[PDB]
Amino acid sequence: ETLNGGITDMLTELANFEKNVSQAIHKYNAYRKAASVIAKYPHKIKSGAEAKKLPGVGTKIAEKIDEFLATGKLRKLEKIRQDDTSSSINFLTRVSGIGPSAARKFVDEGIKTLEDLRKNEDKLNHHQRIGLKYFGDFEKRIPREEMLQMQDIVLNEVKKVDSEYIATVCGSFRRGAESSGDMDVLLTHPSFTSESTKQPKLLHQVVEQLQKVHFITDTLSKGETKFMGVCQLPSKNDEKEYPHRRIDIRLIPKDQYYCGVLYFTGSDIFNKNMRAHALEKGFTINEYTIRPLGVTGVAGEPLPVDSEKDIFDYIQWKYREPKDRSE
DNA sequence: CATTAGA
DNA sequence: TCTAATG
Ligand code: NA
Ligand code: NA
């Protein structure tokens, strides 16, 4: 956690570069597991060889360790750290939509700068373009202040279109969080569940409303169960506009809301934790259900869930408010 | 790990 | 279809 620090840091430093800059998913896979284990290891590693003793630690890695150990630096790393190519990739990859592969491509053709990326929107796709457009606005955290207002509006239409529609801004915001990255609204409906073959219209209706009122300025991807787009709070009695924000809304079959809802709220650890626990209490949890655990090693039969509460009660737990879902 | 775009 | 990019 701190003792095995730099090591893991350099490991993942190394890993990240393999998976993007190169297409070295193995090597990339290498660095990763290794840095995972040296990560749990309780003693101050003091020689590659030492570390070596580990599973995942091969020759190459250890060798680096030794180097990193000796000198507080890495060659491959400082050389890597300097290459404007790998650099350009690291950067380019930022744009929502620009992934490594697109990244390289862009680089080879020579788009290194954001400006470059401009003169050639032509070669960019819709996503990317928007992603390029709000390059600045997308990098920004959302003041809890705007969330409310954003949320307020969401909730107002969902309701305005169909009274039956249950909306639920999850995530960090919902966890109390002061700022968040983007807005994620969980959507469901009664007329919609596990069997009852779709009703695409469901998501579609509200997407339309959010557009009608001008909350939603642009679409990333609309699909029959998950909409990905771009929203904006009305720029008030002017002198001030709102930055564009990323919003996502997904339609959930009523029978599995809460499960998603729990999950979607997080934290990451909180889940695993509750999850790791559901297991001891003879259960199983995941993005949609909670199924009793059978001794024959496995079992199923997805248990009816009324709210986040029933989930706890099942696993026999203490209702922990969203604020306290920190872990 | 599953949904969408795109080509 | 397969591949990418988002989450
Ligand atoms: Na070994
Ligand atoms: Na991106």
What CATH code is carried by the domain that includes residue A124?
1.10.150.20
Strand C-contacting residues in A 233-252, CB cut-off 7 angstroms: 246, 248
Resolution (Å) of this entry: 3.2
Which 3 state secondary structure label does DSSP give A73? coil
Q: Which of A192, A145, A174, A203 is nearest to A322 (CA)?
A: A174
Token reading at A151 = 């949320």
* Cβ A210 vs Cβ A218: under 8 Å: no
Q: What are the start-end ranges of the H helices in chain A?
A: 5-21, 25-40, 48-52, 59-70, 75-82, 84-92, 100-109, 116-119, 126-133, 135-139, 144-161, 201-212, 257-265, 268-280, 308-314
One of A27, A64, A119, A226 is an active-site residue; which one? A64
Q: Is there contact between A100 and strand C, defined as CB under 7 Å from any strand atom?
A: yes
Assess whether A49 and A133 both reside in one domain: no
* Cβ A213 vs Cβ A153: under 8 Å: yes
The answer to whether residue A201 is catalytic is no
Which ligand is located closest to the Cα atom of residue A135? 2
Q: Which of A325, A315, A318, A252 is nearest to A284 (CA)?
A: A315
| Domain total in chain A | 4
φ/ψ of residue A45, rounded to 5: -60, 140
Characterize A284-317 residue by residue with b for buried, 16 or more Cβ atoms within 10 angstroms of its Cβ, and e for exposed. bbeebbbbebeeeeeeeeeeebeebeebbebbee
Q: Is there contact between A225 and strand C, defined as CB under 7 Å from any strand atom?
A: no
Residue numbers belonging to the annotated binding site of A: 52, 54, 57, 93, 95, 98, 141, 172, 175, 181-182, 184, 248
Neighbours of A228 (CB within 10 A): 17
Experimental method: X-ray
Assess whether A147 and A249 both reside in one domain: yes
- For residues A180 and A206, give the distance between their C-alpha atoms in angstroms, rounded to a whole number: 23
DSSP assigned state of A242 = P
Token reading at A142 = 């959302």
The CATH number of the domain where A78 resides is what? 1.10.150.110
Assess whether A35 and A75 both reside in one domain: yes
Q: Is there contact between A137 and strand C, defined as CB under 7 Å from any strand atom?
A: no
* Cβ A35 vs Cβ A7: under 8 Å: yes
Place of tokens 């490991």: A11
- For residues A289 and A86, give the distance between their C-alpha atoms in angstroms, rounded to a whole number: 42
Q: Which of A202, A204, A313, A195 is nearest to A256 (CA)?
A: A195
- For residues A283 and A298, give the distance between their C-alpha atoms in angstroms, rounded to a whole number: 10
A9 Cβ neighbours under 8 A, 6+ residues apart: none
Q: Which domain holds residue A29?
A: 1-83
CA–C1' A44–B3 (A): 44
Which 3 state secondary structure label does DSSP give A45? coil
Q: Cα(A14) to centroid of ligand 2, in Å?
A: 20
Q: Is there contact between A221 and strand B, defined as CB under 7 Å from any strand atom?
A: yes
Of A140, A155, A171, which residue sits at a domain end?
A140
